[PDB]
Structure formats: structure tokens, C-alpha cells
């Protein structure tokens, strides 16, 4: 830096921003010959490139001025209409809600923090939860309450206990943030009883639920869940979806659905952060949904990832030593492993990398960075042949770690 | 709202967000028969649609996976490289600076507020200045100091006076925000002496300059100015450019160039707000600049807008009564009018709309909303025939206002 101590100019918030000793190490691991299970990326093989090509031609023929001009802050009206038709028919989400387009769901999470969170406001998250949601919220200085998951998603039981305990301190929760289907990073899904229980608590204790759902359509087995937002009779849920894993992440288009009063404030907050989400990509996504291509393409995404999930689940079972446990997702992109006898997976990553494999250590997914024996594995973005070999190398890493 | 008093959930900042009785009326005006001079949009006739089409085909043939996948937070590397080569050759901006891609310059302004501004930090702006910059900064609760413009841009001598007065109060400015070439909304340009003087003050008083430059290539007459950033030997300037008026706004791609220490902090702040700027548009913009298309297209944008500016300047001179004054821009999209005898242009808009013409009242462009006799006119987005008739109707509106 040529200004010298450039820190003299930074805000208090900027001074407390870093990231991340491990994400930086992982950035370097990708461009080498380690088998990395660490990534969070969808597989380019699932991008519908031929449909995209046809849509780009159609846009330049019929929609070029709309695609190329500034848009409204709220979003391109035909996309907003086609998404609400889609969510209503596909999920039973109520047309009483309003919808705003976002520059990905990441932007929705930042807007949630800006619109709802004063410093010290309490946000409930799952333990683990999506690391970039914590990153978005952290700028707004909440206090977190962490609710563990099991193989049926958030333990809403423990949420009730913590709400009663906070009540007894004269406090309350403002927002419960959940990624209830095929969680990033856990891979588990909140069952129907718990979704319903979570909404009674939302009514009883008067909080807002944010339901973040990037992965619902990436279902490989089992039957579709009910969206929490489909059960939302009080208008208490803000539902977030994204085109990132069902089209391609490169357009940076997502949507936020919820109470019109909430959406209106979100639109005003968004105006100042980026004016509008890129309209060219909104017009692409509109044709994609309205033209029936999304509906036709989803089965092709599922056919692609299913065997990758299966290969990884087969390899873990065949190779992992006693006492290692993992989730068994019915969908999405991740499998979450729990190690025995107090192994620290952040410490173990050095050894795993030496043996040719990488994963994300679980610690960074916990608001209180308090659990150290967990790992997130990704099965979408490495060749299948490499899934088996990677899981074997991870298994042998764990065996060595368990000794002396 | 289904939740009742939804305000009970909003943050302190959200509670003070409004939008805006004038913007809402002008949303209505655009969809009707009035001649509106109020817009801030570039003309779709200037979008390079054939070059865009060819670039889209090229992307789907050669670059599809990179355009469609997640990007790094900092931006698509070949775009960052081509913009730095472009800015170095075209403007003489130093290659010692780093560059980050933004989701438009609007996003750069929000990130400047996040990165630099604690509540109460002092930000200097021009009077008038870009209204959405004030909107971005306002979330971070700065105090503003307003420095009037004349026909040679910011009156930097009044800036020196105000810097001395603040020093005497034990205070300092953190950031000076300037739109020094073809300003939105004033249309004037800061001359070379003042650019140099601004930087001496930046060194003497130790502040950061933000140079926001959307319009520099939209020059219709005169010789190019030197970018403030081209004169910046201390690394004190953060330079913002954007593709919005030189390609099309629909891709929402801009860039921020400055000290590597500052850019690194900006990258971390951006990561949590949107992950990355849309990679598809970045690949489009990369081919646009790297393929020499931008260089070739700039003369065609100038040829298109110059007669529109000229028609509007001719009409004002022929139709405006005594005592009305306006700027005479050498470029950009706006002409800024000053009314005589204490007319309030926000009051007058009602009469103007009845007579078939709209403009933006200047009050919204002042940090202290203190000046009331100014208007912003746009010449880019109305047909030329309508420019003449619009200015005539505005002239007759003003004559009527001047009477009892
Ligand atoms: C994939 C991911 C996102 C997607 O964010 P975008 O900005 O839309 O790409 C959001 N939430 C979770 C939990 C994710 O894993
Ligand atoms: C046009 C305008 C912008 C451009 O903003 P984008 O977000 O890049 O579209 C920025 N600054 C000023 C002064 C403007 O007039």
C-alpha cells in the first residue's frame, strides 16, 4: 500500500473484516493435482448450454432493448410473474406474497441483515450453517444462537428450549435463518413435523423465518418436502431461491418472496447497493422458466449428480474406519462427515493434503466456531473416478490420524 | 402487510429509508404522453447490438464454462487485465494500482461507504452531486460538507476554506467524492488547475478522493481532460468507471481502480454482499474491450448524442426568458438549469407537467436539499423533435411561473 498505514482510513467494520486462512489455502489447492472435495461449485456439465444459446439468439432478436437497458430495482416484471406462477404451481406458495429479484441469494442475505438487524439483535442459525450467510450477517453485528441439526434437520426441540430461556432473560429472537433442504454444508433435510413446529414457534415467539432454498430441485431420491414457505399462513417466512444450481451461477440472479411490506423495504435498501440486478441475465432467466426449459432441464441435472452422490456414499461405507459417521443426503451437493475420538479436522487437513485430498474443515460453518471434528465433502465437481480415490485417501488420512 | 406492524422488525436504518414522492411521480410520467426531460437513461440506439450478438456467439463457442460458472470476488482476470491496459494507454493511469470489478459503479459507492465510513465521518460532495451516491453513503450516516460548482466544476478554493475551518474545529474530512467530467447532474467539468489543486489538498489534509467517471468517453466537443486518477502520484484516488453508458447498462459491470491495500479491503467487503459480479457479463465486457470494439464504438456514441445536446442548447437559448441560466456541457447526458427570482422548481414541476413537460427538480441532488431554483434536463433519451418542443413548453412554464 502506497498510502502507508491505509488502515487509518478504514471503518470499524472494515477493520474487523478478514477472511480466510483456510479458504486461501483451498484457493491454491484447486489449481494442483490433489483430489479436492472442498469446493462449493456446481458442475459445468449440468449447464444447459444449448438452451442458453437459443435463448441468447432469441433475446437479440426480440428483447434486446429490454435486456440491455437499466431495469427497475424490484426486477424484470416478466421474470417476477413467471417465478411466482412457477413457485405457486410447483410448491403451493401463496400468490399473496410479493417477489423481488436479487443479484443472487447472497445479495438477499446482505439485504436481510441491512433491513432487519440492529447490533446485538439475535439471529438463530443451524449448527452448522451456510458460511456465507454468517459472513453477510456479521457486517450487522448480530448475536447468534446456534441450534444443532440431526439427520432430520434442525432440532426444533432445542430451539423451543433456547427461546424459553431467552424469554426468561427478557430477550427475543428477531430472525431464524434455515437452509432446511439438502443443507449446505450438512446435507440433511428438516422433516415435515419440524417445519410445522418451527412455524408455531415463529407465531408464538413472533419472529421472522428466512428459508434459503438453492437445492430443492436437486433431489435424487425420496419425495419432495413441503417448503416452509408453502406452510406459511402468517406471512412470516421470507423464501429465497436462486438460479445458481438449476441454470448456472454466472448470471447472478436469485429471488426473494415474502410479505409485501417486507419486500417494499428490501427494494428500497437494494436501490442504493446496486440499482438493479443485471437485466440481461433476468431476461435470460425469464425465457428459461417461461419457455418450459427449466422444467425439462431439472431431470437432467438429477440424472447427472445422482451417481456421484451414490459413488461417494458407497466409498465412504466401504473405506471409512469404525467411528466415522456421515450424512446421507437425498439431494444437493454435499455430504457432511463427523470424526470420532476428538480429531480436529482443521489440524488434519495438512495431513490429508499430503496424502492427495482436500475437504473444508467444519469449524468455519459454526457461528461460534466451536465444533472441530466435522468436514464438508462435495460430490458435484470432481470426476467420479476421483470420488472413489479421494474418499480412500481421506479414509487412510483418518486412520493415520487416529494413531500415535 | 400480513404481519401487522411489520416495522417492529425493521432495523434503525431501515426505518429511516424512504423512497421518494418525486421519483414515484416521474415513474408515472415516463409511461404517459408528456415530453420527459427527467430521465437518467442512455439511448438504446447507442447499444452496439450487432457486436453484442457476435460476442454472445463467441462466448457460447469458446468461453461457455467460464462465463457460466461462479467467478472470483475480485473479477474475471482477463477483464481486469484488459481494463488496466485500456486505462493505462487511454488515460495514463498508473499500473501500480489494483482493480476490482463491481456490479456497476453503484455497487462501488456502497462499498466505499462500507469500507471507509463510520457514523459521523465527514464526506465532501459537490453541490449538486449524483443523487444515488448520496443514497449509497447515507446508509453509513456520514456528515456532509457541500462545495458549490461553477462552470469549471467544483470550486476547490471553497473546499480549502472549509478544510481550514474544520481543522480549526479539530476535525477532518475522510473522503471527497467528485464526478468531475460532464457531471450528473450539472454537466460541467473540473478544469486541470482544480484537479491539481484538489490533489494538493488531498495530500495536505490527508483524505481519499473518489473520482466517479461514467461519462468521459461521451465527449462531443473540446479536448480530453486529464483524469484526476492520472495525476495521482500518492495513490490517494479511487477511480470508478462503468460500462453503463459506453456498452449498455443491462450487464451491470463497473470497475474500481486504486491502492492495492484499499482494493483488497473492498474485495473482502464485496464477498459478503454478492459473492461476485455476474461472470457472464464480465466475459461479454472483456471481449468488447479486448476485441477493440469499445474503441471503435465510442465515436458512434458521440455522433449520436452531439446533435441532441446541440438541439437542446439551441432551444434553451432561443426560448428561455431573461435571467434563466444553464450549463453548456462538452459531453455526457445532462444540462443543468438555474432559475431567476427565487422560483422553486419542485413547486413548478406541477405546472410544467400540466403543460406537457417534466424534468428533475434540483433539490434532490443537494446533500442538504437546501437549493430550490435548479433543474436537471436530459438530452439523450428523448427524440430530437421532442427536445425542441419540450424546451419550448418548459420556457412557457417558467414565463408563467414568473407572473403573480
Ligand atoms: C448455493 C448457496 C447459495 C447460493 O447463493 P447465490 O448468491 O444465489 O449464488 C445460497 N445459500 C446457500 C445455503 C447456498 O449453499
Ligand atoms: C451513470 C451514473 C453512474 C453509473 O452507475 P452504474 O451502477 O455503473 O450503472 C455512476 N455515477 C454517476 C455519477 C452516474 O451518473
Automatic annotation (TrEMBL), chains A, B:
Residues annotated for pyridoxal 5'-phosphate binding in this entry: 70, 105-106, 130, 184, 215, 242, 244, 252
Cofactor(s) the record lists: pyridoxal 5'-phosphate
InterPro entries: Aminotransferase_I/II_large, Class-I_PLP-dep_aminotransf, PyrdxlP-dep_Trfase, PyrdxlP-dep_Trfase_major, PyrdxlP-dep_Trfase_small
GO MF assignments: pyridoxal phosphate binding; transaminase activity
Superkingdom in the source lineage: Archaea
Keywords: Aminotransferase, Coiled coil, Pyridoxal phosphate, Transferase
Quaternary assembly: Homodimer.
Family: Belongs to the class-I pyridoxal-phosphate-dependent aminotransferase family.
The protein's name: Aminotransferase class I/classII large domain-containing protein
Lineage: Archaea, Methanobacteriati, Methanobacteriota, Thermococci, Thermococcales
